[PDB]
Each structure stands twice: as C-alpha cells, then as structure tokens.
Amino acid sequence: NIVRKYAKKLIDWPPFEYMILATIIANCIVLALEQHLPEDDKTPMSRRLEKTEPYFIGIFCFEAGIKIVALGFIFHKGSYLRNGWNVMDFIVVLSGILATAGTHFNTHVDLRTLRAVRVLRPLKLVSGIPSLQIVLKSIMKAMVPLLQIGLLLFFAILMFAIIGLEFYSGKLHRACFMNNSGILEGFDPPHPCGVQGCPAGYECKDWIGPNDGITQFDNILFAVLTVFQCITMEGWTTVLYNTNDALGATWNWLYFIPLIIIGSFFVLNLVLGVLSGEFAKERERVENRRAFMKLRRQQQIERELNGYRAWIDKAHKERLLRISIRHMVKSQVFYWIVLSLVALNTACVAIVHHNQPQWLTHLLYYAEFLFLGLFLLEMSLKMYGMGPRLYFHSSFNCFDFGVTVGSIFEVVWAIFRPGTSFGISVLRALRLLRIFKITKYWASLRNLVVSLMSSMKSIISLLFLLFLFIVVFALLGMQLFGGRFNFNDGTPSANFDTFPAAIMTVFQILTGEDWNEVMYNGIRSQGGVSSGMWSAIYFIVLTLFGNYTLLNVFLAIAVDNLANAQELTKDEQEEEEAFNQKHALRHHMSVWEQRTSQLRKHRACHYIVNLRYFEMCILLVIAASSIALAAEDPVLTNSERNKVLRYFDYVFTGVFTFEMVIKMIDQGLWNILDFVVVVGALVAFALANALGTNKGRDIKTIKSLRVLRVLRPLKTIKRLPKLKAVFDCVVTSLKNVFNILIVYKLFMFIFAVIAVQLFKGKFFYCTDSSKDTEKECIGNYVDHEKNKMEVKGREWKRHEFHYDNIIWALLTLFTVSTGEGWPQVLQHSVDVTEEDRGPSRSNRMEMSIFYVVYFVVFPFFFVNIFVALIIITFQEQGDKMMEECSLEKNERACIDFAISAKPLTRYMPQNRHTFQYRVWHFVVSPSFEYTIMAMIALNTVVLMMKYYSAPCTYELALKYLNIAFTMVFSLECVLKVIAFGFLNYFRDTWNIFDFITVIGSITEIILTDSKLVNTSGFNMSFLKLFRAARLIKLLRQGYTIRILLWTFVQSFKALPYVCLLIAMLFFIYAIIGMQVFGNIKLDEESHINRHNNFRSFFGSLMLLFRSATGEAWQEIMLSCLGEKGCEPDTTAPSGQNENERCGTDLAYVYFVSFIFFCSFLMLNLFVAVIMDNFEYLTRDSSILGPHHLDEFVRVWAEYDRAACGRIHYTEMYEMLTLMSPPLGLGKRCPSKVAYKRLVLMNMPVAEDMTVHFTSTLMALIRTALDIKIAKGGADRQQLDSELQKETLAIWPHLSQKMLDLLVPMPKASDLTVGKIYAA
Length: 1319
Ligand SMILES: CC(C)CCC[C@@H](C)[C@H]1CC[C@H]2[C@@H]3CC=C4C[C@@H](OC(=O)CCC(=O)O)CC[C@]4(C)[C@H]3CC[C@]12C
Ligand SMILES: CC(C)CCC[C@@H](C)[C@H]1CC[C@H]2[C@@H]3CC=C4C[C@@H](OC(=O)CCC(=O)O)CC[C@]4(C)[C@H]3CC[C@]12C
Ligand SMILES: CC(C)CCC[C@@H](C)[C@H]1CC[C@H]2[C@@H]3CC=C4C[C@@H](OC(=O)CCC(=O)O)CC[C@]4(C)[C@H]3CC[C@]12C
Ligand SMILES: CC(C)CCC[C@@H](C)[C@H]1CC[C@H]2[C@@H]3CC=C4C[C@@H](OC(=O)CCC(=O)O)CC[C@]4(C)[C@H]3CC[C@]12C
Ligand SMILES: CC(C)CCC[C@@H](C)[C@H]1CC[C@H]2[C@@H]3CC=C4C[C@@H](OC(=O)CCC(=O)O)CC[C@]4(C)[C@H]3CC[C@]12C
Ligand SMILES: CC(C)CCC[C@@H](C)[C@H]1CC[C@H]2[C@@H]3CC=C4C[C@@H](OC(=O)CCC(=O)O)CC[C@]4(C)[C@H]3CC[C@]12C
Ligand SMILES: CC(C)CCC[C@@H](C)[C@H]1CC[C@H]2[C@@H]3CC=C4C[C@@H](OC(=O)CCC(=O)O)CC[C@]4(C)[C@H]3CC[C@]12C
Ligand SMILES: CC(C)CCC[C@@H](C)[C@H]1CC[C@H]2[C@@H]3CC=C4C[C@@H](OC(=O)CCC(=O)O)CC[C@]4(C)[C@H]3CC[C@]12C
Ligand SMILES: CC(C)CCC[C@@H](C)[C@H]1CC[C@H]2[C@@H]3CC=C4C[C@@H](OC(=O)CCC(=O)O)CC[C@]4(C)[C@H]3CC[C@]12C
Ligand SMILES: CC1(C)O[C@@H]2[C@@H](CO[C@@]3(COS(N)(=O)=O)OC(C)(C)O[C@@H]23)O1
Ligand SMILES: CCCCCCCCCCCCCCCC
Ligand SMILES: CCCCCCCCCCCCCCCC
Ligand SMILES: CCCCCCCCCCCCCCCC
Ligand SMILES: [Ca+2]
Description:
- By secondary structure, the protein is mainly alpha-helical.
- A hairpin with a 6-residue loop joins strand 4 and strand 5 (790-793).
- Helix 16 (358-383) crosses helix 17 (395-415) and helix 19 packs across helix 20 (499-511).
- It is globular.
- Bound molecules: cholesterol hemisuccinate (9 copies), the ligand CC1(C)O[C@@H]2[C@@H](CO[C@@]3(COS(N)(=O)=O)OC(C)(C)O[C@@H]23)O1, hexadecane (3 copies) and calcium ion.
- The site of one hexadecane (R16) has 10 residues, from helix 18 and helix 34.
- Residues 299-315 are annotated as: Binding to the beta subunit.
- IV repeats lie at residues 911-1174.
C-alpha cells in the first residue's frame, strides 16, 4: 500500500484545484438557498436541492480518494491526515458518505446529528486557498496571549457564581400575581416577592424563574450562565431589579456593580492591554519590519518622484486652447471653485426631510440635474481638456469619475423606478477631505490612507474570514434552530429559518447586543429550562469568540495601519526637516514609540490673601457645597431640607463672592467658570428675593439658573494641580483624535444623508395593524392581542427613532453606534414599504445591507481607529527629570531593584530539635502541601454542589463536608504557626488571608448552630462570604494570573486622579439629572420606573451607570423628554393640573453627551493604565525585565545560601551553567562562549575570594543588557564612573556603603573573580 507510480500526484495541479474551488462555492450557495420549515415540512425548492447532495458527496470523496492515493494516510509522515486541514476535510466527506447511508437503513439509527457536519463545508474554502490560511493563522496567533484573560475571566465568573449560589439560590420563585382566582394576572415585567411582599391587592404565588425559568441562580450551571450574561452587560439590570424585588434593594448593588466593573470593564482593560502588547511585539518581527521598509522605500520613491514631476514646466486647436485648459483647470482658484460648489451640493442634499415644502422638492429636483451636469462639465474639462490617457492617475480623480457615473446611474434608475432613491451623490462630500491639504495634518492622514491602501489584500482577506465564520455559524444555527422558532406568540424577527435571517441574527449575537433574548428563544425552542438548555452553548461560544475575535481583528487592522502611518510620517520630518535642511546648507516620542524602538534595537491688603489656609480652606467649601448639592430633594420643593440647603446656598455664594472679589482685586481684568457660577447665584438670589411674580413663568427661571450650581465641583479642577494635569491629559488626547473625529463626522453625515434618502417618511405605523395609511388610521378598534380584547383608539404614529431629517438620522445612527436597540431599528427598517404607508413584516429585507456596512465602518473600524490613536500617541505623564533619565530608561531603570531583594527565606527552624524539624518539616517537602491543595480542590467543589430543593441527606452531606474541610483548614492554620512562629506566620499576606477565612468559616459553623440566640437586630448571612472566599486559594497556584492582577492593580494605584475625573463626571451628571428630571412622575410602562429614576442621588447614579454600561439608555432618554407627568410634590397648592410639563427636551443633549463623555473618559482611564504597564505587556524572553530577574534569588537561595559572600567562584558556574539564558550561559553553553561572557564581567573580591549578592546581580544585569561595560582596563572603570554618576542621578537615597556595593569599583590592580579562570 506504498505502491509508487502514483500518476495521481500530477493530477493535484493547476486546473483540478480550481474546479474543487468551484464545487465548494456551488455547495455553499446550495446551503444558502435552503429554508427550514417547522415540523418535517419542506419547501418545493428544498426538495429540489436535496437531490444534489450526492453530486457534492461524490466529488468530495473523489478528492479524498485522489489525495489519499497520491499521498499516504497516517503512517507515511507527509501523509494525508498529517496535514491539519485534511483531517477536517476527511471528517466532512466521511459524514457526507455516512449521512447519505440512511435510506438503506431507513435511518433507523435516528441520527438527527450527522448532516450538521455539512455546515463545516464553507471552511473548505480556507483549506483550498492558502492565501487565507496564512491570514487565519496570523489572527489565531494574536489570540494566544488571551488564553490567560480567559482563565482570569472564567475564574471571576466562577467566583461570582459561587456567591450567587449562596445568596439567590432559591429566592426568585415567588411572584406577585393578581388575586383574580382562576385567571392569575401578574405584571408584564413580572414582580417577584420576598419578605418584600406584594404591593396593593396582589398575592404572592408560585412562579417559574424570570425568563421562563432561565435567569436564576439555582444550580452552579444556572449561576455561571446568569453571571456570564451580566458580564456581557446584556440585561444585567433586569437581574439586578429582580433580586432587588425578591430580597430588598439594600445589598444587591454590591454584587452587580463589582460584577460589571471587575468582570466587564477591568477585563476589557486587560484584553486591550494584552493585545496592544502583542501588537507592539509583533510589528517588530523581521518578516514585518521587512514588509514595512518595503512600504517606506516606495513612499520615498513617490515623494521624490512627484517633486521631479514638478520639473515638467514646459511653456489648429490641438495646442491653441488645450494649453489654457490645463492651465486654468489646475489653478488654485479652480480647486476652490469646485470645493466651494461641492459644499453647496452637500448642503442641498442635506435639507431634504419628510414633508418638505412643495417648492423645495422642485427646486432640489432641478438642483440634482444642475450640479450633476456641472460636474460632468468640470470632469470632461479634465478629460477632453487634459487627456483621457493620463486622467486616472489621481486617486480622487478616479473617485470623482466613479461618483459621476454613479449619479448618472441614480438619475436613470430613479426615472425607471420611482421610489427607492438611495442617492449616491452625497459621496462628493468626501472631496471635502481634500481641504486638509491646506493644513499641517495632511501627512498624518495621507499616510494613513497609503498604509490602508497598501494593506488591502490582507484586510479584504480578513473580512472574508470573518464572513466565512459568520456563514458557518449561520448554517449551524439553521441546523439547530431552523424552523423551531414558530412559537404560539409568533415567530420572532431574530429567526434562523432562512439564510438572510440567520446571517442577521448571528450578526446580533456577534455585536452582542440582545444576544440575551435570542438565547432565550433558542432555549425554549429545544425544550425549555429542561432538556433544552444544552443550546445555551451556541450563544456563549459566539458571544465570546466574537466579541473578542472581532476586537482582535479590527484592532490589529487599526493599530497596524496606524503605527505604520505614524512611522511613515516620522520619516518625513526626519528627512525634509533634518536631511535637506542640513545638507542644503526622543523629542516628544510617545510611550508606544519609545517601546517599539527599544524592541527594534533589541490691592496692598488683599495680596495677603495667601495664608496657607486660603487656597486650601476654599477647597473644603467647594467640597461641602458639592456634597450639599447631592442632598437636595428634587421633588419636595419646599420641604425642610431644601430650606436648610437654601440657607447653605446663601453661605456658599457668600464665600465664593468674598473670594472672587479679592482675587479680581489682585489680578485685574478657568476663572470664567468661577465668574459664571457666582453671577448666576447672585442673579437667581436677587430676582427670587425681589418679586418672584409679575414676570412670565419665571419660577423656571430660578429653577434653571440654579442648575449653574452644579458647576461648583468643577472649580476643584484648577485648584488641585494634579487633577488639572489629568484634565489636561484628557484634553490633549481629544486634540490628538480630532483630525479623525472630523473624518468620522463626515462619514457619519454621509450615512445619515443616505439613510434619510432611504427611510424618509417610511417609519410610520398605525396602532391598528390592519390599517396602513393616515386616512384609514382613524376611529376605534378592538385590541385582541393584549389577550384582554379591549377597545383602543387608532393613532397614526412614528417609531421613536426614525430617519426623516438629517438630525434624526444622525441621532438614530448614533444610537446604532453605541449598540443599544439597533435590532429594533433594523426590524423597523426591513419592515418598510413606502412614504406615508405602514409597515409590512420582513418586506425589503435588503435594507439590512445598510446596517452591516454601517457596522463594519463605524462601530468596528473607526472606534478601533480611535482606540489605536489614543494608544499609539500616549505621552508619559510626568517626564521632566533631565530628559527622562537620559541613559537609564524603563527596562534599564526599573530593573535596578537591586536596591531591594537582598533578603532570603530566614524561615528554617535552625534548631534541629523535635517539632522544629518535625512540623516545620512535615509542612515543607510536599506530602502535606499536596494533600492540602487536594482539600482546596475539593472544597471548591462542595461550594459548587449547592442547589435548590435538594433531597435532604445531600443537604446534610454538604454541611458535614464543610465541617471536615474547615477542620482541615484550621489544622493548616495551627500547624504552621507552631511550625513557622507567630510573628513569621502573619507576614506572608496569604497566611493572614487563610486565617481570616478559617476564622470566618469557624464562626459561621458556630453561629448557624445553637447556644446563641439569633436576635438583637443583626444578620448572619454575610459570613457565607468567608466560606466562598476559599476558592481564592486556587488563585495562589497561579503566578500568571497573579502577575497580571498585581501588575494591572498597581497601575490603578498610580492613577488616583484619572478615576476621580470619572467620579466627577458621574457626580456632575447625577446632579444635573436630579435637578432636571427629578420630578418626572414614575410610570411602570415607561423607563422611569421605581427602579430607574432620577428621584435621588443614588437612584440617578444607578441610572447613569446603567446607561454607561449601555443598557437601554435610548429609552431612558426618550422617557425623560418633555411633556411628561409630574410628581404631586405634596408641598404646594398650585400647579396641580398645570406643570404637566415635567420632562425636558434637553434629554437628547443630556444622554448623547454623557454617552460620549463616559465612553471617552473611560478610554483614557484604559489607556492610562495600559501604557503604565507597557513594559510588562511587551515583555519578551530575549529582552530582560525583572520577570527573569527574580529567578536569581531562587537559584541563589537554593544553590548557595551565601548571605553576602560564601560563593568564592564555584557558585558562579554552579549558577549560570544551568538556568535559562536571558541571564547568560545556560545549560547548553558551558564552553569558551561562557568564557568570553565571563571575561566581560569583572568585579572585586572578598574574604574567601567571595563576592556580594547585588554586585553579582548588576554583573548579570549589565552583561546581559549591556549597561555601560567596556572590554577591560581603566576604560571599564571610567565607564563605571559614568554609571555611578547615572545611579546617583536617578537615586540619591543610596548610601555610599550600598552605592559602593552597586558600583563595586574593580580597579585594575585588584584582581577579580572574573580574571581567575580566564588567565
Ligand atoms: C452644511 C451642511 C453640511 C449642513 C447644513 C445644515 C442642515 C442640513 C440642517 C440644519 C438644521 C436642519 C433642519 C432643522 C429642522 C427642520 C424642521 C423639520 O421639518 C419640519 O418642521 C416638518 C414639517 C415641514 O416641513 O414644515 C425637519 C427638517 C428641518 C428643516 C431640518 C433640515 C436639515 C437642516 C436644515
Ligand atoms: C457625608 C458628609 C459627612 C460629607 C461632608 C459634608 C457635610 C460636612 C455636610 C455639608 C452639608 C450638610 C447637610 C446640610 C443639611 C442637612 C439637613 C439636615 O436636616 C434634615 O435633613 C433632617 C431631617 C430629619 O429630621 O429626618 C440633615 C443633615 C443635612 C442633610 C446635612 C448633612 C451633612 C452635610 C452634607
Ligand atoms: C462613505 C463611505 C463609507 C463609503 C461607503 C458607503 C456606501 C458605499 C454604502 C453606505 C450604505 C450602503 C447602501 C445601504 C443600503 C442599500 C440598499 C440596498 O437596496 C437598494 O436600495 C436596492 C434595491 C431596492 O431597494 O430597490 C442596495 C445596497 C445599498 C444601496 C447600500 C450600498 C452601499 C452603501 C451605499
Ligand atoms: C477535582 C477537580 C476536577 C475539581 C476542581 C479543581 C481543579 C481545577 C483542580 C484539579 C487538579 C488541580 C491542579 C493539580 C496540580 C497543579 C499543578 C500546579 O500548577 C502550577 O502552576 C504549579 C507551579 C508552576 O509550575 O508554576 C499547581 C496548580 C495545579 C494546576 C492544580 C490546580 C487545580 C486543579 C486543576
Ligand atoms: C468540573 C466538574 C467537577 C464540574 C462540577 C460538577 C458538580 C460540582 C456540578 C456540575 C453539574 C451539577 C448538577 C447539574 C444539575 C443538577 C440537577 C438538579 O437537581 C434536580 O433535579 C433539581 C430539581 C428542582 O430544582 O426542582 C440540581 C442539582 C444537580 C445535580 C447539579 C449539582 C451540582 C453539579 C453536579
Ligand atoms: C469529596 C467531595 C468533594 C464530594 C463527594 C461527593 C460524593 C462522594 C457524595 C457526597 C454527598 C453524596 C450525596 C448525598 C445524598 C444524596 C441523596 C440521595 O437521595 C436520597 O433521597 C437518599 C435516599 C436514601 O439513601 O435513603 C441520592 C444520593 C445523593 C445525591 C449522594 C450522591 C453522592 C454524593 C454527592
Ligand atoms: C471546576 C472547573 C469547572 C473550574 C475550576 C476553577 C478554575 C477556573 C481554576 C481552578 C484551578 C485554576 C488553575 C490552577 C493553576 C494554573 C496554572 C497556572 O499556569 C501558569 O502560571 C504557568 C506556569 C508558570 O509560568 O509559572 C495558571 C493557570 C491555571 C491553569 C489556573 C487557572 C484557573 C483554574 C483552572
Ligand atoms: C477575584 C480576583 C480579581 C481578586 C484576587 C485578589 C488579587 C487582586 C490579589 C490578592 C492578593 C494578591 C497577591 C498578594 C501578594 C503577592 C506577592 C507579590 O509578589 C511580587 O511582588 C512578585 C514576586 C517576587 O518578586 O517575589 C505580588 C503578587 C502577589 C501574588 C499578589 C497578586 C495579586 C493578588 C492575588
Ligand atoms: C473604574 C472605577 C473604579 C472609577 C470610579 C467609580 C465610577 C465608575 C462610578 C460610576 C458608577 C458609580 C456607581 C453607580 C451606582 C452605584 C449604586 C449606588 O446605590 C446606592 O447607593 C443604593 C442602592 C441603589 O442603587 O438603589 C451607590 C453608588 C454606586 C455603587 C456608584 C459608585 C461609583 C461608581 C462605580
Ligand atoms: C500584529 C498585527 C498588528 O496584526 C497582524 C499582524 C500582521 O499584520 C496584519 C495586520 O492586519 S493588516 N491587513 O492591516 O496588515 O495583517 C495580518 C496579515 C492580517 O495580520 C495582521 O500585525
Ligand atoms: C497544521 C496547521 C493547521 C492547524 C490545524 C487545523 C486548524 C483548522 C481546522 C479547525 C478549524 C475549526 C473547526 C471548528 C469549528 C469552527
Ligand atoms: C490620498 C488620500 C488623502 C485622504 C485624506 C483624508 C483621509 C482620512 C482618513 C480616511 C479613512 C478611510 C476609512 C474608511 C472606512 C473603512
Ligand atoms: C455580510 C453580507 C450579507 C448580509 C446578509 C443580509 C442581507 C441579505 C440581502 C438579500 C436579502 C434577500 C431576501 C430574500 C427573502 C428572504
Ligand atoms: Ca444592551
């Protein structure tokens, strides 16, 4: 079976690989055409197609046959299966052979599980095109570092699930149903019970869980799914509200806020940091520097070539008029005429709206033709007037020709199909980007476009892989859930029946927004909270490996193509401003640039205002005034508190004016903020004290000039010199991303204009689904669908987020960008028919293309462009210390913790008595520590084995297992105190943690039993935490999770003001919200509920956090708008029927801005952390950081136990000849290579020919990193003098005892431990 003379290996060749490539495309089309019907039903077309599967199976088994006979199978090394892709090729064809062997046995096996392998057939495209595999491998290569955030993530999910199991395990099963015996009612958002009982006339009956039983903490598997849902931030507030109802709203915020902060924000920070480190380390590989230099050289060629092409300045009608054309048609007044007339074109097509006055329709009708013809003329004048042959040589010239032909297309197609007019003539607004040519920002952007246009075969071949995996997951979802979504309510819009509706729900699940509800449908599809929950695993493996592989793809693209355009533009100013300006006669280098370059290298009276207690005693008043803002009651206008705080308002404005006046005295004429606040306070006080009446509706005047008070916290920014510095960092980041913010705004405007042309006037609907016009939608109608059959009135409405004016298009596209509620906008956009006609379900299903090209551009591409610009260009915060430690920088400087790490164990009993070497022995030499890690790994299981409604003995089984594990752990505790000593035990920061946990568990076991009455107004539940903290003991045996956590928490401790700006943002907006929307009448039908309201400071803080985490903020914005009801206020006799205006239309500004500020101020806090640890995140095995450097302590303590000496020299080559080679020799290099390393290390001697600890430490450090070392002689000592000067320059706190130790001064006369075996 090794028969040579194959003759089939020559058939694996040019043509029979381009036929397999076509059979696969045909097969993918066939799998696309299929439609899945609910119960054994089949469309005629699907029966038609089911008669092609044998053809494809035949061709694929033929491929297996020819490849197998022309190669080996397994035993041959280069055989068939030894390829990685051929094994899955073979599995797919195997299942093709098997699944078509059903009729023979009538499928008595009842597989229902083998044609689901067919969905892997699209991946055979990757197998057939290696140009796609070598992109896929690169992508999968960038995600290997992530498999420690995942373990960090799954730990957090587990740690918060255990806790959930303790606290909400069975407490979500009673709901408040209307008494109404027989027909129980309940709410539409069901209201749970607890000791918090039913409100008015409802009774507390049984209930399956919240989402038909799916969103509860019953098992551990139900808790690690609810908590995974909350971490993805989808519907985490519904869970928070359920547990608030079911238990009481006082402690639940402690579980769900740190679950979102730790699990959802901190994990984004880790993932961004890890990926950015990986991108810095991957841009410098040789095969990537090579392909970048190939781009920089070609940019040099073109840059000089255009300058040379400027030297072509040559000075009957073939030359008589065609000389003046090309003159004028390139003059600087012509560019400006064209660019000031395209700016009229894009203002003409941006004023179209719905119901535009009938004169505008005709005026703009003439305008399209006028401008189109004018651009035809001033395009031909470039083509017939300068030459078609050399016409396509400018990029935007090709682009303008394309837009002109497209506009001609649009005119014709509007003529022959009136209606849809998607109007590609706003694309000419792209020419406005040419305006940048007149600024200094042209290079930064032309280089970006050059770096994008070069790397386009690798962006397309990468979007194509995203598309293949979406197709595979769409077909898999069709298999699992195809036609099973026909519920008795009606099939949802997020189907899996047909292909265009499976693609657009896999797209939701990737963009991860409302994957919640799709998963609930896909669970009740296959059963319920029952046999059906095994399919919560398609929506987890697609909302994880999608929310993360799509930020590693779109961040790789945007960091690569933007670090390229930053290094391309650093080599213009480094030539045109540093080469010619010299030969024709650091320096603000960001953190990323530094790191990647390092990798590639491998009146008189008042002036006594100043009292040391004036600029610090006004700060206290600012703080007290800010806090007093928080305690206003928004609703009870004339309560006790509001009067007390009004007197405080007098006090505070008095202080602020008495200091503003003296400041203006000493300063004459950030302070404008002080001025505005004091002027507003004075004006409000004056015109409220004076009359208050006799001016039209001027209660709101004082109410609105008291919103200016919220600026009082802002006054601190100038006072605190470091808060001011962080604020300025935020502003300079905003200025960095401002040439791209404008390109973003321009592209978003173009999409908004297109969306207005496409959906204007079409977002209307009658409240009665049968009528579909404003003429018909009048009267009353019986509503059966509420299942109450009640007579309502027909109203003709718009949808709330429509696209009938460019302002409304911009707002409802911003809503799509933030992600919230875009599935509903897509649902409205497909169900669209004609102007002023009502919807028709899943009509015009192609308007979903607009909503994927949108996502590929704005939420995926530009947002990652912004993250990458802020990462790449981030300046070190404080660097004004002699050019940033000119000679010893991050890795050099920080590796000098040799001033530390002197100590060693010092824990051995050193008594050799009994217990001294008995217990402290037993403890060491694992036969005890392994057995105790086993008890940790089993106590982690008895915490996962809680569940609700257990049999009985299982419950006691758990109690006694807990007792046994607590007994073993308390034996841990008092078996190391007496083995390590009382003082030594409480000093390792993990022993005290274990002690706290064992004490907590012991007291829990005591308290839950008798001999202490469980009264005196105190609750014992929190002690369960001490039992669930034992799972943290699994983290101790980490050291790769622990290093990340320590590294990223340290850099949170070094930015105490970056997360004070976010607290101040939240404070300012919470106070504004309380003032403005504080007295909206709560309505459970709206989103100003009893849960979600601005009624209190902490309620508004929760509302703002809910919105920041992107949780239906759009509907809070809509339910805060004008004309809403109002609270009774129970303190006034007037304004009962009136002041039915207690909303406001500033909600749009209030929520569109916060979402832009909180999403920006968080980005900074992310980058400010990432760039803090950029040395850890770009650490490498080649390049030393402290990561390798602590191994030296281990090898020292074990192999030497020197204690400042006690080495002589044997320990040296007893050290270096074994341990890993970032420090030098290593095991495989005990040769003359080691000899020539040692001859570079030279350092003095001691009593027994010995040396010091840290002297050797610097010896290894400098001999590896090359930190100021010569080849010998007094040369190395003068270099050492330089090094000593540098060390004193960094650290003055080193005494000459320790300093001389670090600069051991090996004079030439004094022989070394290095020049002993050398000579
Ligand atoms: C220079 C370019 C890029 C921007 C120019 C701005 C316009 C595109 C914006 C500015 C304000 C907008 C207007 C703001 C308010 C309205 C009223 C509103 O129409 C109605 O009141 C409906 C009933 C009616 O037409 O009488 C929506 C269209 C319109 C004119 C908007 C159309 C688009 C306008 C003119
Ligand atoms: C949380 C505190 C310690 C932060 C620092 C600010 C405090 C020094 C002061 C500044 C203004 C003070 C407030 C000014 C006025 C009032 C009204 C005063 O009267 C009532 O509300 C009594 C109502 C009742 O009897 O129930 C109660 C304290 C309170 C809220 C004060 C609480 C303490 C505040 C916030
Ligand atoms: C400004 C930069 C980002 C250029 C990229 C934008 C355009 C290339 C995109 C924006 C939205 C897209 C459009 C949005 C949705 C549709 C509707 C879809 O259905 C139709 O309108 C045609 C059939 C019909 O409805 O009669 C056809 C593709 C089209 C025009 C899309 C084609 C590509 C468009 C114009
Ligand atoms: C019985 C199990 C299935 C219940 C749940 C606990 C597990 C997650 C246990 C099973 C065995 C345990 C492991 C047994 C031995 C080791 C080796 C050791 O791993 C190290 O990182 C060692 C130090 C190093 O080499 O850096 C200590 C942790 C670990 C992985 C243990 C971690 C916890 C594990 C994986
Ligand atoms: C890595 C390994 C060790 C996973 C850990 C296994 C156990 C710690 C977990 C995983 C599966 C869990 C089980 C999944 C489902 C069920 C069925 C369910 O029991 C019922 O019949 C409940 C009925 C009801 O609640 O009305 C809840 C307990 C139990 C056995 C769970 C108990 C805890 C189990 C065994
Ligand atoms: C070593 C630690 C970390 C885990 C040990 C797990 C198993 C060895 C044991 C411990 C408790 C046992 C459970 C204790 C009680 C019950 C209830 C029992 O059902 C009854 O109602 C009991 C009827 C009877 O026997 O009288 C069925 C077995 C079961 C689930 C046992 C199954 C086996 C379990 C899980
Ligand atoms: C019971 C199942 C369902 C989950 C149990 C909890 C896991 C999330 C925990 C238990 C043990 C933990 C592991 C214990 C030890 C290690 C080895 C450790 O690896 C290293 O640090 C590499 C060695 C080195 O470089 O020092 C860190 C990850 C890991 C797998 C830990 C990851 C998190 C684990 C798997
Ligand atoms: C559920 C998760 C998110 C919380 C777990 C707590 C961690 C944030 C903290 C708690 C205790 C910390 C540990 C406490 C002490 C040390 C020793 C310390 O060691 C070093 O400085 C480096 C090694 C050396 O040079 O000796 C810093 C890492 C480590 C393991 C810390 C790592 C980060 C830990 C695990
Ligand atoms: C990244 C972090 C460390 C920066 C600083 C914190 C901020 C992100 C802010 C914004 C959201 C704030 C939280 C928003 C919501 C709440 C609930 C709020 O709840 C209550 O006081 C009562 C219960 C209820 O909310 O109904 C208490 C403040 C708190 C935790 C806030 C604490 C401070 C937070 C986390
Ligand atoms: C680490 C980093 C930034 O991401 C990798 C890898 C090599 O370059 C990538 C970047 O994507 S692209 N098409 O803009 O070149 O291109 C591919 C080949 C897709 O892989 C990309 O660089
Ligand atoms: C040796 C190079 C190839 C590495 C092994 C094959 C990888 C590709 C096959 C598996 C792809 C994922 C299949 C599961 C569904 C997404
Ligand atoms: C030679 C062209 C000069 C262009 C100057 C402005 C460029 C602005 C950045 C363009 C980014 C395009 C991204 C489009 C969406 C994928
Ligand atoms: C990623 C690109 C594909 C996007 C798929 C969704 C749009 C599908 C457009 C064609 C819709 C045809 C509907 C036929 C009847 C269901
Ligand atoms: Ca959401």
